[PDB]
């Protein structure tokens, strides 16, 4: 299934995922597409920050749905 | 048609629609799981491995039931699932709306202690006005939600897909506002450049924030976290001048504010189980499976449309 990862700007990254995929795996696929290391990524769904050990299905994130990407600046 | 379940169809319908419940074996993933007894509540269909039975497929030792919902407005690909909205109910109890005092259907039932009920038209209004005014509530564990309109404690909506009531454009706005609010509650900042608004989580003790990333991610604006103008070494110079439910109705709008039908075959009377509409006659020599609601033999239609009621 597809999810869309968007920045708050509107910039969209398309990922092919499975419900069973961890948020860490989603970040890996973001690393691969945009070259943002997973450490610098924060993913949010419906105002909730997603935890790395949880799956997409844990948050009931549906196919075609959108996660918001925010950047951690250290 | 009596519909117990409401879902959001994300194409073709793109709206909250009556849903069809179905069950499959969790191991072989075929519609082969016959349940010992039907679901009786939402917990039965929403919590994994809660219900059990027998896979009819012989090349399978499966015993655990996996429930799923499809839209009821058209035929669907077997895997073309829709999200269920467990708070939405058909108003089979004729409960008045907390806001408009009308008896409408369907309704949404808040999970406050009072179990207050609001019609879907008033729920929409609630959502739109609260989203336009940025008065949705952020919880670190629950996200961007709304409580019961009565302001009851511990009553934030947990299933955030209920905000699909808003429609596609406004839902996206809700998710956008929710992300922004999440950032701010974490002590983060949004890029102040028009047409950007990137979410940034810098060090807590840093005043200079840069909208980092390439031409793809960031805009490169360096701003002061305090005044949200471009970074500067002085005192901040920017100045911002600020221009600037009835208790009786609530009492009545509670979900918990006769019932004998004979078995079609053996005619021994039975009263409702409350939830499950799937009757299995308890008389040992009958065991006819039948629907409480329709007084007919059990079938896939009653199954999908109203396996259980609330
Ligand atoms: Zn549909
Ligand atoms: Zn099986
Ligand atoms: Zn309430
Ligand atoms: Zn109403
Ligand atoms: Zn920017
Ligand atoms: Zn400043
Ligand atoms: Zn009987
Ligand atoms: Zn029926």
Q: Determine if residue B124 is labeled as part of a ligand binding site.
A: no
Contact B141 A48 (CB under 8 A): yes
**Helix ranges restricted to H, chain B:** 42-46, 120-132, 168-185, 247-252, 300-306
Q: Output the six-digit token pair for B52.
A: 């059990």
C-alpha distances out from residue B80 to A20, B14, B23, Å: 17, 13, 14
Would an 8 Å CB–CB cutoff place A20 in contact with chain B? no
CA torsion, ordered B193, B197, B198, B201, to nearest 10 deg = 100
Residue pair A56/A46 in contact by the 8 Å Cβ criterion: no
**How close does chain A come to B188, measured CA to CA in Å?**
9
Q: Determine if residue B119 is labeled as part of a ligand binding site.
A: yes
Q: Which long-range contacts (CB under 8 A, 24 or more apart) does B188-197 make?
A: B188/A70, B189/B223, B189/B225, B189/B228, B190/A8, B191/A9, B191/B218, B191/B219, B191/B221, B191/B223, B192/B221, B192/B223, B192/B228, B192/B229, B193/B219, B193/B221, B195/A9, B195/B219, B196/A9, B196/B221, B197/A8, B197/A9
d(CA B298, CA B271): 17
**Distance from residue B190's CA to the centre of ligand 6 (Å):** 14
Would an 8 Å CB–CB cutoff place A71 in contact with chain B? yes
d(CA B188, CA B205): 11
d(CA B265, CA B261): 12
Domain ranges of chain A: 1-74
Give the ligand at the shortest distance from the Cα of B213. Answer: 5
Q: Which long-range contacts (CB under 8 A, 24 or more apart) does B48-51 make?
A: B51/B23
d(CA A56, CA B27): 20
Residue pair A39/A28 in contact by the 8 Å Cβ criterion: no
d(CA A43, CA A27): 8
Which residue do the tokens 């976290």 mark? B225
Q: Which residues contact B79 (CB under 8 A, 6 or more apart)?
A: none
At B180, give phi and psi (nearest 5°). -60, -45
d(CA B309, CA B255): 13
Query: To one decimal place, what's the resolution in Å?
Result: 2.3
The bridge status of strand B117-119 relative to strand B33-35 is: unpaired
Domain ranges of chain B: 6-89, 94-254, 261-306
CA B244 to chain centre: 34
Which residues of B are identified as catalytic?
276
C-alpha distances out from residue B151 to A35, A69, B97, B119, B246, Å: 44, 31, 15, 17, 12
CA B255 to chain centre: 17
Which residue do the tokens 């907390």 mark? B98
d(CA B153, CA A65): 30
Q: Determine if residue B127 is labeled as part of a ligand binding site.
A: no
DSSP state, residue B106: S
**Distance from residue B75's CA to the centre of ligand 1 (Å):** 8
Q: How crowded is residue B156: how many other Cβ atoms within 10 Å of its Cβ? A: 21
At B161, give phi and psi (nearest 5°). -70, -10
d(CA B129, CA B135): 8
CA B79 to chain centre: 20
Question: Where does A18-61 show beta strands of DSSP type E?
Answer: 41-45, 48-49
d(CA B142, CA B120): 22
d(CA B117, CA B119): 7
Coil, strand, or helix at residue B224? strand
d(CA B225, CA A73): 13
A63 contacts on B by Cβ (under 8 Å) = 10
> What residues of chain A, 37 to 56, have a C-beta less than 8 Å from chain B?
42, 44-49
**Nearest residue of A to residue B82, measured between CA atoms:** A62
The bridge status of strand A66-72 relative to strand B199-201 is: parallel
Residue pair B83/B8 in contact by the 8 Å Cβ criterion: yes
Give the ligand at the shortest distance from the Cα of B291. Answer: 8
At A49, give phi and psi (nearest 5°). -75, 130
Packed helices B168-185 and B120-132: angle between N→C axes, nearest 10 degrees: 50
In the beta sheet, which residues pair with residue B190? B199
B217 contacts on A by Cβ (under 8 Å) = 7, 11, 34, 36, 71
Query: Into which CATH architecture does domain A1-74 fall?
Result: Roll (3.10)
CA B37 to chain centre: 25
In the beta sheet, which residues pair with residue A28? none
Residue pair B117/B108 in contact by the 8 Å Cβ criterion: yes
Rg of chain A over all Cα atoms, to the nearest angstrom? 11
**How close does chain A come to B61, measured CA to CA in Å?**
23
CA torsion, ordered B99, B105, B106, B110, to nearest 10 deg = 30
Coil, strand, or helix at residue B301? helix
DSSP state, residue B234: S
The angle subtended at Cα A52 by Cα A50 and Cα A55, nearest 5°, is 75
Longest CA pairwise span in chain B (Å): 90
Q: Determine if residue B71 is labeled as part of a ligand binding site.
A: no
Coil, strand, or helix at residue B267? coil
Q: Which residues contact B100 (CB under 8 A, 6 or more apart)?
A: B119, B121, B122
Which helix (H) or strand (E) segment holds residue B15: the answer is strand B15-25
At B101, give phi and psi (nearest 5°). 65, 5
């Amino acid at each position: 299934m597809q999810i869309f990862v968007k920045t708050l700007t509107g910039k969209t990254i398309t990922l092919e995922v499975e419900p069973s995929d961890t948020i860490e795996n989603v970040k890996a696929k973001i690393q691969d597409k945009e070259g943002i290391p997973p450490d610098q990524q924060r993913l949010i769904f419906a105002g909730k920050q997603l935890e790395d050990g949880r799956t997409l299905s844990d948050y009931n994130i549906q196919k075609e749905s959108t996660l918001h990407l925010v950047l951690r600046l250290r | 048609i009596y519909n117990s379940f409401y879902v959001y169809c994300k194409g073709p319908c793109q709206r909250v629609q009556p849903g069809k419940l179905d069950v499959q074996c969790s191991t072989c993933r075929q519609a082969t799981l016959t349940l010992t007894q039907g679901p009786s509540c939402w917990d039965d269909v929403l919590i994994p491995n809660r219900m059990s039975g027998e896979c009819q497929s012989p090349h399978c030792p499966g015993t655990s039931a996996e429930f799923f919902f499809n839209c009821g407005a058209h035929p669907t690909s077997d895997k073309e699932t829709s999200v269920a909205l467990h708070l939405i109910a058909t108003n089979s109890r004729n409960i008045t709306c907390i806001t408009c005092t009308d008896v409408r259907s369907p309704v949404l039932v808040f999970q406050c202690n009072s179990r207050h009920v609001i019609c879907l038209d008033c729920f929409h209004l609630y959502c739109v006005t609260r989203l336009n005014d940025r008065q949705f509530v952020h919880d670190p564990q629950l996200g961007y939600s709304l409580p019961c309109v009565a302001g009851c404690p511990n009553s934030l909506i947990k299933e955030l897909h209920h905000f699909r009531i808003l429609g596609e454009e406004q839902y996206n706005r809700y998710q956008q506002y929710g992300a922004e609010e999440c950032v701010l509650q974490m002590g983060g900042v949004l890029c102040p450049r028009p047409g950007c608004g990137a979410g940034l989580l810098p060090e807590p003790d840093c005043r200079k924030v840069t909208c980092e990333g390439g031409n793809g991610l960031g805009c490169g604006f360096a701003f002061c976290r305090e005044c949200k103008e471009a970074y500067h070494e002085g005192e901040c110079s920017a100045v911002f001048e600020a221009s600037g439910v009835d208790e009786r109705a609530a009492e009545q709008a509670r979900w918990e504010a006769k019932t004998t039908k004979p078995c079609p075959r053996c005619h021994v009377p039975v009263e409702k189980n409350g939830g499950c509409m799937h009757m299995k006659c308890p008389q040992p020599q009958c065991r006819l499976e039948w629907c409480w609601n329709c007084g007919c033999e059990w079938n896939r239609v009653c199954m999908g449309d109203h396996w259980f009621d609330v």
